[PDB]
Design a protein around this ligand. Structure first.
Ligand code: FAD
Ligand code: FAD
Ligand code: 8WF
Ligand code: 8WF
Ligand code: MG
Ligand code: MG
Ligand code: MG
Ligand code: MG
Ligand code: MG
Ligand code: MG
Ligand code: MG
Ligand code: MG
Lengths: 463, 465
């Protein structure tokens, strides 16, 4: 603090108290500004440890609502909150190095970083790795070039951009034209919730809004959901995966199951369906707008770090961890969320438990003699008899467009609820509101929802 | 030109609100602009006896008075736009908006060309309602185009945030001492009228109210200069206020620079000639991080092009000269309004509103008349042959916002003056009055929702957003 560095402007610290220049509270490095890192930032003791954060993102992103912003069901301001307003809350003194990680130096015990606003290392006693993971193309060529991921706010802007501009170009031709019709097609690759949600929200849009001001388009508007697996939402059970789907078909969504994208050309994509009666067919879906909401694959730094640790030499999906959520082959390092290969699903839920646990599990390290200095790694935490991480699952949701939603709850293996009608939609909202972090976000979310109830959505390509 | 396909102006849309006779019935009215002038007009006009085409680069309508509250996001930049369309979905007959911009006007050939910045490219008109606006004015002072931020459109907004937002960034990374850091933090608004004042105002409110809350250090060193050629601010009020205005501004740690001209605007600093009552040309260099230019409204090429292609508009300065029926002095079938019509009236919103609502009323009358069943001898003859009342102006009010949480206003109509004064008292009004005067349910709530939200929280000052 007060000095010159190699990270971007948003670099801040809070002066909440003051440090002893020559200091000893162990210093913890959080990687990321998302579901793990931020939740860990919530439950960590900011007094016993001082804490630095590295992510090139200075806000936090409430991903579950993400796909609903691109049609301006929600503004992108509503669903995000800047780290700071978290670290201001926090007790002791916290630092956001406003930049991205670049290499983990486990042996050299620092994390090397560069900013796209800048050979900088950074000190860490302990490392919390929560950078999460990017999406996977599966080298299906063209996706990168013509595709649209749906992972960060930019993408929400990027897609609205692309969609509208078609809608516009599309209007200036005749109904009889087919190019028009192609520009009005919309492929959403990936039939998990996000993609579904996306699809559905683009429907909720054509329908509820657009059709009013322009129905000649709205009629010709095509939305396709496309999924390798035999059903959408394979995380939900088969009963609802049928309803949800049938309902999407009711909303008018073309739902290509057991389909893979083989390649993405500019104006259409090559797709192969694999059939019940054994045979692979092919299709060709033409599109204006291609949202690629599928799968994941860990970042380079995470993977980079697989080499520089010996145990980590075969870590396929992400860093591998013990049941104290610690890197198998490090000690001072922990991986949570999506950069954390732990045989578990890679969701918000998972990551949130992962962080909470590890905060206590951390805080609860604060009264032990060995831990003041410095072999095998997990033997220390087995000894004092900490509890190892036990994932309490608690269901999964999905918006379906046109005001309905499947949903499921559980706690342990007791199913509280598992329905899927207007009732369930009207919960799903409440529910998500509940599971927000910040207030501002919540209320802003709430007002969007309200405003939409009494008026249209905001689909400006300007903004 | 009209059937289906074209190139320029992507937004062009039509509202099929009845069914179109091809060999068509009604006189075609051509409206230029999406602003006050042009949308006040739309709200009232009868689209049954008239077909209506709107030419504007801007598909929304901009709620000007609340503009300056957006860079800091007291309002969100969206909360004060409205796509044109949402008005034509209120109008009865057929309305048609092209997403293009009027380039030249061709009176006697009766066409107003368009070149969208996305594409004989001409348009026909029985009647023309010219409400394109004026642009801000540099007065040739130098670089303002280069280093300055106008405050005229939504973009102008985004820009000024980014700018000042980023300055905030770079400056954090400085040792307190460094002066430049201190400079990055200087903010110069040029202009004293309610815009400049409001800007200056809203900026500070952030700094005071919002910034310090988490970067207290920096707030301290931020400076907001308000430069002005004239004696006192907000000239258009009684002295009591336009002083108090000044007073209260300076309360809020604002460094006001009266009787001051800008001569030149360097990159980091702007060269200012201060001239005193006693007659002494002093000078001062003022350094700035962000430069806002809330002054002047000179008129657009289209408008000034059209002075040539007419005789009566040649040595007209402020815009198109207009008879009392708001037809151009010189041409018949062409009517000017709001800012781009030389009116002898304030170049303000309020004027433009009535200016176009009265043309609306008037247009309703003419529909009955027979002599406007030709035209599909002089300009104003049929307006006097049918005893048309001229336009006249009912100066309903004046208003401005200033202090951390304070304001003043005047609501007097027609020589009887109603309320006037300052304080939080009058703060709570400005709000109530400005919503009231908002031309959209949506807009009004969005804004409302902003203010509500804004109470329990900071404003959002996200730079890429
Ligand atoms: C649109 C969408 C909707 C979803 N909805 C749901 C839902 O309804 N329910 C559910 O259970 N799950 C949902 N998920 C899944 C869930 O959001 C993710 O699995 C979860 O975000 C993982 O959190 P995380 O902390 O691992 O990473 P994230 O929360 O994604 O955050 C990663 C952080 O690291 C930063 N970062 C990235 N790389 C680096 C680097 N090299 N150095 C420093 N920082 C870096 C990122 O900007 C970010 O700050 C959704 C995902 C998406 C995309
Ligand atoms: C920040 C701010 C606050 C203000 N507050 C107040 C206030 O409180 N009270 C008040 O009385 N006045 C106020 N004004 C002044 C007021 O906004 C203007 O006088 C008013 O906009 C004039 O309306 P108009 O229709 O003449 O022009 P505008 O409202 O500018 O309309 C011009 C329209 O034409 C479009 N256009 C431009 N060029 C072309 C072209 N070549 N072809 C087609 N279309 C074109 C523009 O996008 C716009 O839609 C304020 C101005 C600003 C900048
Ligand atoms: C408040 C009530 C729950 C607290 C959060 C628990 C973790 C959590 C958080 C979410 O946002 C989820 C979204 C969809 C599905 C499951 C989810 N889980 O488990
Ligand atoms: C009903 C609400 C009143 C409508 C009156 C419109 C006239 C009007 C319009 C404006 O845009 C103004 C901007 C600033 C100050 C006064 C203004 N007035 O009086
Ligand atoms: Mg994270
Ligand atoms: Mg996130
Ligand atoms: Mg992630
Ligand atoms: Mg993670
Ligand atoms: Mg306007
Ligand atoms: Mg106008
Ligand atoms: Mg104007
Ligand atoms: Mg005008």
């Amino acid at each position: 603090g007060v000095e010159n560095s190699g990270a971007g402007p948003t670099s801040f610290k809070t002066m909440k108290v003051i440090d002893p220049q020559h200091s000893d509270k162990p210093n913890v490095l959080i990687l990321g500004s998302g579901w793990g890192a931020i939740s860990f930032l919530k439950h960590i003791d900011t007094k016993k440890y001082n804490v630095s954060i590295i992510s090139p993102r200075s806000y936090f992103l409430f991903t579950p609502l993400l796909p609903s912003a691109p049609v301006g069901t929600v503004d992108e301001k509503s669903i995000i909150e800047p780290i700071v307003n978290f670290a201001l809350k926090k007790k002791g003194n916290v630092t956001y190095y406003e930049a991205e990680a670049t290499s983990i130096n486990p042996d050299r015990n620092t994390v090397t970083i560069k900013s796209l606003s800048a050979p900088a290392e950074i000190k860490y006693d302990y490392l919390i790795s929560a950078v999460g993971a990017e999406p996977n193309t599966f080298g299906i060529p063209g996706v990168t070039d013509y595709g649209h991921f749906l992972k960060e706010i930019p993408n929400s802007l990027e897609i609205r951009r692309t969609f509208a501009a078609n809608l516009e170009k599309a209007n200036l031709l005749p109904k009889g034209d087919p190019e028009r019709r192609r520009l009005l097609s919309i492929v959403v690759v990936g039939g998990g919730p996000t993609g579904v949600e996306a699809a559905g929200e683009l429907q909720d849009y054509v329908h509820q809004d657009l059709r009013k001001f322009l129905p000649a388009l709205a009629e010709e508007v095509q939305i396709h959901l496309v999924e390798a697996l035999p059903i959408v939402l394979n995380m939900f059970e088969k009963k609802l995966s049928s309803y949800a789907q049938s309902h999407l078909e009711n909303t008018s969504i073309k739902v290509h199951l057991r389909t893979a994208v083989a390649k993405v050309e500019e104006k259409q994509l090559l797709a192969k369906t694999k059939h019940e009666d054994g045979k692979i067919t092919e299709e060709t879906i033409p599109y204006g707008t291609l949202i690629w909401a599928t799968g994941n694959k860990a970042r380079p730094v995470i993977t980079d770090l697989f080499k520089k640790i010996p145990e980590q030499n075969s870590s396929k999906r992400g860093l591998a961890v013990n049941d104290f959520l610690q890197v198998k082959g490090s000690n001072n390092i922990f991986a949570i969320g999506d950069n954390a290969f732990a045989g578990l699903p890679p969701t918000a839920q998972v990551a949130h438990q992962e962080a909470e646990y590890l905060a206590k599990n951390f805080d609860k390290m604060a009264q032990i003699p060995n831990f003041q200095k410095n072999d095998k790694i997990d033997l220390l935490f087995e000894e004092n008899n900490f509890k190892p991480f036990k994932y309490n699952d608690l269901g999964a949701l999905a918006y379906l467009g046109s005001e309905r939603a499947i949903a499921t709850i559980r706690s342990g293996k007791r199913t509280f609820y598992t329905g899927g009608g207007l009732m369930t939609f009207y919960l799903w909202r409440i529910l998500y509101l509940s599971m927000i972090l910040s207030a501002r976000s919540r209320l802003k979310v709430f007002f969007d929802w309200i405003k939409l109830a009494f008026f249209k959505r905001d689909f400006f390509k300007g903004l």
